[PDB]
Amino acid sequence: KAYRGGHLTIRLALGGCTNRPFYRIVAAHNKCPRDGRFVEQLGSYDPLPNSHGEKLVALNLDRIRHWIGCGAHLSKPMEKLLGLAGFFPLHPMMITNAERLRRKRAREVLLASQK
Amino acid sequence: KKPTFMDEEVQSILTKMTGLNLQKTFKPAIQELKPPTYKLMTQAQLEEATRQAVEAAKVRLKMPPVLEERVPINDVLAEDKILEGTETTKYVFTDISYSIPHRERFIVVREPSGTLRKASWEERDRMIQVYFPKEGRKILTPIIFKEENLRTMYSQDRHVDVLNLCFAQFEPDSTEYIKVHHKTYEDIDKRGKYDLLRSTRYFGGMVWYFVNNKKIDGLLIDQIQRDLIDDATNLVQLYHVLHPDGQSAQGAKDQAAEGINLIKVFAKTEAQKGAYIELTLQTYQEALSRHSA
Amino acid sequence: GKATDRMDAFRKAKNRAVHHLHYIERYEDHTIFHDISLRFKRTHIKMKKQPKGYGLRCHRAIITICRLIGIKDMYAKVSGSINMLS
Amino acid sequence: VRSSVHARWIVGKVIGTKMQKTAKVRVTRLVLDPYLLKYFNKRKTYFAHDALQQCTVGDIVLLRALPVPRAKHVKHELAEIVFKVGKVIDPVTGKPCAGTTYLESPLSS
Amino acid sequence: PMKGRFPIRRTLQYLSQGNVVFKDSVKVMTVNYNTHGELGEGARKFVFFNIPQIQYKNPWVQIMMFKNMTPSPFLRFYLDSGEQVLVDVETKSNKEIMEHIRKILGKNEETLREEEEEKKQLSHPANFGPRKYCLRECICEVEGQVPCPSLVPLPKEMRGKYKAALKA
RNA sequence: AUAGGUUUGGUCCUAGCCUUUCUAUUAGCUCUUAGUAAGAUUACACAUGCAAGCAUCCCCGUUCCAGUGAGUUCACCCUCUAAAUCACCAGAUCAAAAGGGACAAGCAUCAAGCACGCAGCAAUGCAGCUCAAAACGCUUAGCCUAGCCACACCCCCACGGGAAACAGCAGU
């Protein structure tokens, strides 16, 4: 489908079945459908912990670097995954959400103790 | 220095000890069968074909390397404590770039505590299996390697099968690989089944293990009983090479031992069953003279 | 066997058969020595030598005759007329 | 070099010289038959610009692709005449030949 | 039975059994040969046997035959650069002709196997997708992972139909 | 196909039809639970609700996603090179238009098409071009499925007209 504009984005294509999410980190034209055509599959992400309590993320780091050099963008979930991996700095919203969670749990603990 | 398992002299000695039984090496495999093909061959053509099969058997019996147990991986890359408590599950990030040796891939783990460490050896092997699956290897360790099942396979005398499963499932430096190989070698020693590994690629490893543990008495006894006295002599020479400052080697050097003399010297020194070895050698020599004269 | 009665026909046929026995060479006592393509009148029989445990994948009549002969493993395709006698 | 014509080099037979400075060339390619798995000749027609008009019906010619089509159908130029009709010169010996017979014996030189 | 003499020539196995894969430079191959003469037997058998294999291995090279046009048989390759390679095949057998053309204008085994490895690069073992492209279709096929809900139902606590009940 | 039934008074051969196998839709009868996948027959007409916002105003988006299969060799490779991304440029990536090639089925009781070519800077000249190796034509069909092509009420298009549009979701 001849698209106007748009750009390559490294993003998560959601496969899996109902209640069984699974993601394919793909470099795809941003205008293409979420689970539709893609240029290259750069990795995968299993949000469900496995038998060992691990969320398996596979990153084709060489090709991710190649596409970032070619000018691909990064969806925020992929940015946060890379930050977790250490490939990028931790996302500002990762840090801020951690801080918000800390404040919320501090409130909870303080209220529980007061009670 | 002391020679290693991969040195050329040791490789030659161990290959000669192993032997190249074509029937055993190319024993028919219980697998999906296709109808056979038939060729008309002269005597020269048949000799050429058997020579090619011998070369193929050498390739097939190429010994696996003996590698020291890998050291545990403990290396923390980052300590981002801000992530502490944000997630309750580990993330395992794998570099699945195609053109990278699996011992060079970066497989890191982000823990719930915010620690970005390097994946342990077990996790590394598990993830490499997950993403670059190998034929014959399973992610979850097969239960056959539990002692209760390993002893069943030993009782059936499937030591070669146990070693094959171990070599398919674990890495040569794996703790489990080394443990299972040593256990199989020990059981072969106890039950005197050293012929189960002859003409297989694991005979070299078994011999190396016995030599390094100074327990080649049983193997010498079996070889003399089976008349492979050249193999026994090479085994004793290898033992002396790997223990140059040993009582038996020094005694042989003091005397002039160049064969059955070497085996007798080993029987008299550095042998837990020296009397038995001497009896076996005496019986072999007596039979040799009997059917020679 | 020809007879006005079915049992007499059976007796005649099975008694005459034993005086007209072939001997079939079986490779390793389970199959034939090589692939055989033949045409008897308008019936083509294409028999393939097969490995052990393959079974008899043949016309049912060929399966019966092979069980009698002693062949365990063989493939067989019958083209043309399927006349049982031919 | 960067020609937009698919067939860069094609050897064909001239089947018509009725157009000025153009030679109609029949180029045959072996095309596998998917069912019979046998190679048959698939012939296509190419117009080859011939500036000098030196092509005769029956000549085997080598056509080179023009950098761009110079006409609605003339995408090739007459690169060479490999076998002039009736005036073949055996490439092996460079002597004129009439079919399988040497018009000049190669021993002549 | 298969029609024609030597019906093995009409099998994919035979066609792929050819070992000549021309360099990218070769564009045309004209095979001039004589239908008669004991010296042209090699060229005759070449056209009868190996031309199908050469064409199968090189689908984009125009192979064109010529009959009784010159006293002696010969191949002539027209390359992309404009060069012409003449290969006089008189007195050679078809096997010798194949070896010669492979030596002078065919890709070497090293180049062919590097091209094979380059092709292999595309099919990454770690990619998940349809069977036509990937070894596995979903991570659920990997042991130790949460299995496919179709085969093994998920825990009610992991099903949103009951997370909703809990949140209600 | 490992075949089987069926012509005859009978046998042999050829031969069509049918059985046995696996799917999909529909219908009859029957039907307990759980998980998952799939889900109008109709390119016929649509009540009703929602499906495109964001943002310190400018811009950007509503050209995407989602839908359908009416039409249908616009999809694939090469050349060239727009628009777009790479904070600017960079060549890299992606990819239009244009040029070259390849590319569905049936009917030859569709066998001729009727200007379908070339050269020249132009003026103009030559009379050529496709086709029984299937041109021209009629009919049928979404396709080569990580998806692609085409359409988007009809007049192929949509200035204009007919007319007032769910082939977006739920629904009629």
Ligand code: FES
């Ligand atoms: S196909 Fe993988 S979860 Fe269902």
Ligand SMILES: [Mg+2]
């Ligand atoms: Mg029903």
Ligand SMILES: [Mg+2]
């Ligand atoms: Mg009619």
Ligand SMILES: [Mg+2]
């Ligand atoms: Mg239609």
Ligand SMILES: [Mg+2]
């Ligand atoms: Mg409508």
Ligand SMILES: [Mg+2]
């Ligand atoms: Mg319209």
Ligand SMILES: [Mg+2]
């Ligand atoms: Mg609707």
